[PDB]
Amino acid sequence: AEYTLPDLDWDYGALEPHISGQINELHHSKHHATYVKGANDAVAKLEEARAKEDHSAILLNEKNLAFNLAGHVNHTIWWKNLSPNGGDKPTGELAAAIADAFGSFDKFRAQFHAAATTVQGSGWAALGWDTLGNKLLIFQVYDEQTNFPLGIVPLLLLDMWEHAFYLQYKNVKVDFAKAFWNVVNWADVQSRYAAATS
Template identity: 30%
Template sequence: MTDHTDPQRRTMLRNTVAAAAVLGSAHAAGAATAPPALDKPLKPTLTAFESQAGPKPLAFDPAKLNGLSEKIIRSHWENNYGGSVKALAVIKKRLSEALADKDLPPYVYNDLKREHLLRTGSVVLHEHYFDNLGGNGQAGAPERKVIADAFGSFDTWETEFRRIAAGLGGGSGWVVLGYNTYTRQLENYWLADHAHGPAATLPLLVLDMYEHSYQMDFGAAAAKYIDAFFKNIQWEAVASRLASLSRA
């Protein structure tokens, strides 16, 4: 049961309710509604060619997940996600150097930009994936309402999310519950890889369906991995992402 006496949790619930109101208002207004003007200039944390210092630490104890082994989580975090963080740093350094080379053909530069796109997608999606693990899999009432309002019912959303994931079993890709800031819709998305995602979409819940996410624990039984994922969803992370919409 959710402990509604916890102050941090109460604040998160209020923010999620506020996000629900924002999503509802946006849906009613339609896609043609102009976005609000920025009240202050954006301040990127890093400049264009800089990279983060290293992999983002796990926010949970990987030995305490329900049905997902510590071994697979650590391997996934260190090798697949960590490898992309390191590769992205290398690519950004090479891009900075290559830009200064006036004789470098544009198509050669674009080979680096393609890798930049792939590695950026991998880092962002992996960080969302790991951040929405470590919970008890029980969505709170505000999160359920936001999703139910968008899909007709919470069960309809879960059925589609699971079906997309099952269709990716044995291959590669991602499943993302996201809010599209242009169409102003909450939808589930199928992603074939790190590079091809829906435009103008903020990820709210991310599931990695690359085989490295589950093969060590489940072999080819992707359905068992999907079940385990749902048991470990950190819905507080989803609520926090929803709340960020209301702040935006």
């Protein structure tokens, strides 16, 4: 079927004072809403190019399909990886994978904060699992669909676009990145990590 906007499982002002309800609102409502309309739209123009047998604008069509489909895919996962009752540290299988992988929790976290505040332009920090070589790696994604390999399973994303922190942190991106840690919903990530390794 068509893609659609998921609802949040918290009220827009729930991450205050770490992330304002003004931002969650424009973000879920303006920003993600337009990526889901863009995704359904690129889907429908390729169905028509498929019937008129005219692949003359293939390049804008495959570029509009990857851009909206990926902004909706990262957005969808960023709402479930944040929680009002979040913070602290991961536990169980996940916390042991993370120290085995980056040596230690605080080390994984100095690299994740280093990959998210050095993007030149918009992009995000993403923790993913590579099934080719079964490892847990951190990637710096540019924009919404570039800089990582195909088939990588996404587990915890930090949105670096300016719309995610300009109305409250203005240009101090590092303090928005420090505040994200107090709202991480580690239960969602742990659950992502287990279906990833099954």
